[PDB]
Write an enzyme that holds these catalytic residues in place. Structure first.
Site, PDB file in Angstrom:
ATOM      1  N   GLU A 156       0.820  -1.199   0.000  1.00 54.38           N
ATOM      2  CA  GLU A 156       0.000   0.000   0.000  1.00 54.38           C
ATOM      3  C   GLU A 156       0.861   1.259   0.000  1.00 54.38           C
ATOM      4  O   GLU A 156       1.045   1.908   1.034  1.00 54.38           O
ATOM      5  CB  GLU A 156      -0.955  -0.024   1.201  1.00 54.38           C
ATOM      6  N   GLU A 273      -5.414  -8.673  -0.615  1.00 58.94           N
ATOM      7  CA  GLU A 273      -6.038  -8.467   0.695  1.00 58.94           C
ATOM      8  C   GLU A 273      -7.550  -8.359   0.545  1.00 58.94           C
ATOM      9  O   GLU A 273      -8.153  -7.357   0.921  1.00 58.94           O
ATOM     10  CB  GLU A 273      -5.487  -7.220   1.383  1.00 58.94           C
TER      11      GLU A 273
HETATM   12  O1  LIG Z   1      -7.202  -4.648   7.093  1.00 56.97           O
HETATM   13  C1  LIG Z   1      -6.163  -4.506   7.766  1.00 56.97           C
HETATM   14  O2  LIG Z   1      -6.144  -4.588   9.011  1.00 56.97           O
HETATM   15  C2  LIG Z   1      -4.871  -4.232   7.044  1.00 56.97           C
HETATM   16  O3  LIG Z   1      -5.147  -3.894   5.699  1.00 56.97           O
HETATM   17  C3  LIG Z   1      -4.007  -3.336   5.013  1.00 56.97           C
HETATM   18  O4  LIG Z   1      -4.042  -1.906   5.130  1.00 56.97           O
HETATM   19  C4  LIG Z   1      -2.654  -3.870   5.586  1.00 56.97           C
HETATM   20  O5  LIG Z   1      -1.673  -3.890   4.534  1.00 56.97           O
HETATM   21  C5  LIG Z   1      -2.752  -5.286   6.189  1.00 56.97           C
HETATM   22  O6  LIG Z   1      -1.564  -5.549   6.966  1.00 56.97           O
HETATM   23  C6  LIG Z   1      -3.994  -5.464   7.075  1.00 56.97           C
HETATM   24  O7  LIG Z   1      -4.746  -6.591   6.617  1.00 56.97           O
END
Ligand SMILES: O=C(O)[C@@H]1O[C@@H](O)[C@H](O)[C@@H](O)[C@@H]1O
Ligand SMILES: *[C@@H]1O[C@H](CO)[C@@H](O[C@@H]2O[C@H](CO)[C@@H](O[C@@H]3O[C@H](CO[C@H]4O[C@H](CO[C@H]5O[C@H](CO)[C@@H](O)[C@H](O)[C@@H]5O[C@H]5O[C@H](CO)[C@@H](O)[C@H](O)[C@@H]5O)[C@@H](O)[C@H](O[C@H]5O[C@H](CO)[C@@H](O)[C@H](O)[C@@H]5O[C@H]5O[C@H](CO)[C@@H](O)[C@H](O)[C@@H]5O)[C@@H]4O)[C@@H](O)[C@H](O[C@H]4O[C@H](CO)[C@@H](O)[C@H](O)[C@@H]4O[C@H]4O[C@H](CO)[C@@H](O)[C@H](O)[C@@H]4O)[C@@H]3O)[C@H](O)[C@H]2NC(C)=O)[C@H](O)[C@H]1NC(C)=O
Ligand SMILES: *[C@@H]1O[C@H](CO)[C@@H](O[C@@H]2O[C@H](CO)[C@@H](O)[C@H](O)[C@H]2NC(C)=O)[C@H](O)[C@H]1NC(C)=O
Ligand SMILES: *[C@@H]1O[C@H](CO)[C@@H](O)[C@H](O)[C@H]1NC(C)=O
Ligand SMILES: [Cl-]
Length: 616
Positions: A156, A273
């Site tokens: 990100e 994700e």
């Molecule tokens: O949803 C979350 O807690 C977070 O989402 C993204 O922002 C991160 O890169 C992840 O490490 C995590 O899954």
């Protein structure tokens, strides 16, 4: 309530089914330079055993943040830069030991050294670092292995999670070029993608759209070439509690990529994700039980039946990862977005850790039984046909066999899920009408069922009053609800048709597994290990690489204390490749061995013995 009809024609293999969901991931806590303490901790060792114990490589990769905070350095730019990879070797061997791959996000600062990707001194040092890495792990694991890995950019980029590193819109493009050429230098066969962010409509997500423009039209910082390697495009889109909105958001992005970048038309897209709700640490009761498990399946079901299978757009979606290999924290062992529930049992000398397998992780074991061909299925209520964009849906596969240790197989996975919401006082009547089953030797069928009533260690834990440090007795009780409720093999009726009429709860999961008999019995269990947990307990983990068929009832485990005879260990029937052995007597020092038991009561050979000796 008119019943939910489910029709499945096992005669019609429509097109291949891809296991595009077999990924998890996580992020070390603060400070990032101490990531090695979290990552090589005994906790993570157990955590990755559990991840890799899903049958049939059901979980493949583990996308891992701050990997390059495992690399230390010495000397300096002018003096002579030297890297120490010892902690990184530790974590990558650990994945290897559990037959898992890294989702290698090229992310970190080599413990301080890298500070600014506008400084060209550093952009070059990074290229050679990446090249050193690749070459080192190519020599360690073989090029064949390393060429499977998904190398990825910093996580990100448009969320500015760079720590103390100056990564500008331009510096980021430089950083990419170093990575792309750094890997190129070791081998042209390695794979690199990015950016790993939301791709919001402009001018939002500047670096995500920038990088696409760069690789598409811009200049290579090193060679000066037109455009740059972009093997895949990774985005993160989460549901905000809606399962279908994940897919809806992905189509919007994809459509923009298809129009603004004609060359990327066939470029694979990942959602690495693809979570129901952002914020993994946020307590949510639905994260703790089947409600999450089923919603995960429901998402995958939608992606297959509404995106991959058959579509006008036919976007090039290739991977989906639920980012949920995080270790949980008191006081919410079960309610966080994790595959396992951590219990730091501090009141023992010494203190020890215990993990419980959550339903979401078990549900990944049911998905793992899906084979390579998708079967025609129709879910309907009243007269109306329902797609996967509804609370009940289904995925069904067939297996075209080859060898004599193999035979025809079908797996029908039915979900009942209203996303994050549960409905404890509701029954959903379903009529499965399987047809077209081709003839074969000894056709049996097996059901495996999950719901909050029968299969929720959280529900059990809550029932026992939510003990912070459960006793051994209490762990055994919570663990009894790990595996699904399994009906023993029942031969099929003649004519090749099966009709079941289950009353599914909400949430709930049902896998109907239909199998032909292979000529030969199962293959052998391998890589048996005994990991200590605490005095009187240990974990048995092992591989099913050479076991062969998936028509497995359970793994029989036998234990011989002292030098006496081997004795079967009485336990719940489980296809899971890991078991916590907590004898009420506490006698665990001896030898263990394990073998597969198929649906026709045929044992595979035993694994090599693993001796265990408890040292108090
Ligand atoms: O949803 C979350 O807690 C977070 O989402 C993204 O922002 C991160 O890169 C992840 O490490 C995590 O899954
Ligand atoms: C049995 O023994 C066990 C020991 O072996 C005991 O285990 C301990 O249990 C404790 C609780 O009982 C645990 O305490 C809790 O720790 C957690 C986790 O802490 C770590 O991570 C934090 C989050 O990191 C994320 O975010 C950052 C940046 O945003 C990223 O850089 C990370 O990568 C990571 O990112 C991911 O996650 C986020 C999600 O937030 C995602 O958005 C991202 O995308 C990524 O996916 C991090 O903040 C912590 O760092 C602190 O500590 C470091 C040293 O460890 C230090 O270097 C850091 O500077 C920082 O220190 C500061 O804060 C801590 C407080 O945590 C202070 O002590 C310190 O002085 C500094 O001020 C760490 O790396 C943590 O989330 C919890 O903290 C919340 O809750 C506690 C309440 O207990 C509060 O004190 C905190 O303020 C905090 O805020 C709460 O309240 C807020 C307002 O109400 C609310 O908004 C929050 O939601 C939250 O509820 C706890 O501190 C302990 O971790 C654990 N030990 C171990 C080894 O596991 C066990 O307790 C014992 N059993 C019993 C029964 O006694
Ligand atoms: C999935 O079904 C939902 C309904 O639950 C759809 O959302 C509806 O349909 C359109 C979307 O453009 C809009 O009228 C509303 O947002 C929703 N209407 C109602 C009455 O709820 C959603 O579009 C469907 N998704 C897919 C991919 O088909
Ligand atoms: C790398 O770091 C570890 C941990 O500090 C240390 O034990 C090891 O000796 C270092 N490597 C070398 C080559 O010195
Ligand atoms: Cl989630």
């Amino acid at each position: 309530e008119a019943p939910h009809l489910v029709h499945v024609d096992a005669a019609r293999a429509l097109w291949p089914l891809r296991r595009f969901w077999r990924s998890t991931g996580f992020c070390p806590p603060l400070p990032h330079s101490q990531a090695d303490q979290y990552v090589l901790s005994w906790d993570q060792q157990l955590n990755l055993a559990y991840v890799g114990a899903v049958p049939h490589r059901g979980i493949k990769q583990v996308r891992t943040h701050w990997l390059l905070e495992l690399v230390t350095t010495r000397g300096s730019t002018g003096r002579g830069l030297s890297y120490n990879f010892t902690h990184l070797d530790g974590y990558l061997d650990l994945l290897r030991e559990n037959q898992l791959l890294p989702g290698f996000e090229l992310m970190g600062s080599a413990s301080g050294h890298f500070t600014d990707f506008e400084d060209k001194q550093q952009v070059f040092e990074w290229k050679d670092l990446v090249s050193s890495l690749a070459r080192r792990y190519i020599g360690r694991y073989g090029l064949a292995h390393v060429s499977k890995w998904n190398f990825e950019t910093w996580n990100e980029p448009d969320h500015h999670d760079f720590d103390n590193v100056s990564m500008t819109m331009q510096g980021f493009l430089n950083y990419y070029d170093a990575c792309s050429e750094g890997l190129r230098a070791a081998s042209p066969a390695l794979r690199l993608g990015g950016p790993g962010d939301s791709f919001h409509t402009p001018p939002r997500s500047p670096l995500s759209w920038g990088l696409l423009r760069h690789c598409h039209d811009g200049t290579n910082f090193f060679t000066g070439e037109a455009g740059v390697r972009l093997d895949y495009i990774s985005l993160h889109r989460k549901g905000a509690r809606s399962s279908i909105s994940i897919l809806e958001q992905e189509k919007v992005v994809a459509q923009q990529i298809r129009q603004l970048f004609p060359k990327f038309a066939d470029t694979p897209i990942y959602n690495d994700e693809a979570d129901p709700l952002v914020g993994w640490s946020l307590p949510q009761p639905w994260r703790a039980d089947v409600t999450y498990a089923a919603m995960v399946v429901k998402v995958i079901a939608q992606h297959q039946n509404l995106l991959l299978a058959n579509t006008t757009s036919a976007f090039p979606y290739a991977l989906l990862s639920n980012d949920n290999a995080f270790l949980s924290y008191h006081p919410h062992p079960f309610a966080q977005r994790t595959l396992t529930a951590r219990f730091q049992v501090n009141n023992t000398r010494p203190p020890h850790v215990q993990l419980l397998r959550k339903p979401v992780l078990t549900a990944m074991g049911l998905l793992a039984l899906l084979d390579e061909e998708q079967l025609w299925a129709e879910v309907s209520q009243a007269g109306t046909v329902l797609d996967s964009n509804h609370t009940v849906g289904v995925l069904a596969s067939a297996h075209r066999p080859q060898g004599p240790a193999d035979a025809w197989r079908a797996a029908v996975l039915i979900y009942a899920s209203d996303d994050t919401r549960a409905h404890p006082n509701r029954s959903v009547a379903v009529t499965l009408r399987l047809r077209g089953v081709p003839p074969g030797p000894g056709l049996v069928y097996v059901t495996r069922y999950l719901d909050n009533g029968l299969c929720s260690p959280d529900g059990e834990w809550r029932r026992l009053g939510r003990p912070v440090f459960p006793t051994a007795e209490q762990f055994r009780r919570m663990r009894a609800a790990e595996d699904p409720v399994a009906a023993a093999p029942r031969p099929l009726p003649a004519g090749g048709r099966l009709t079941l009429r289950p009353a599914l709860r909400l949430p709930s999961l049902l896998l109907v597994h239909v199998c032909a008999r292979p000529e030969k019995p199962p293959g052998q269990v391998t890589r048996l290990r005994a990991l200590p947990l605490t005095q009187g307990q240990l974990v048995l983990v092992w591989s099913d690489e050479h076991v062969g068929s998936k028509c497995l009832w359970t793994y029989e485990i036998q234990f011989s204390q002292d030098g006496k005879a081997y004795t079967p260990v009485s336990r719940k029937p489980s296809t899971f490749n890991l078991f916590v052995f907590s004898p009420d007597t506490g006698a665990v020092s001896g030898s263990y061995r394990v073998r597969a038991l198929d649906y026709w009561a045929r044992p595979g050979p035993f694994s090599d013995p693993v001796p265990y000796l408890e040292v108090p």
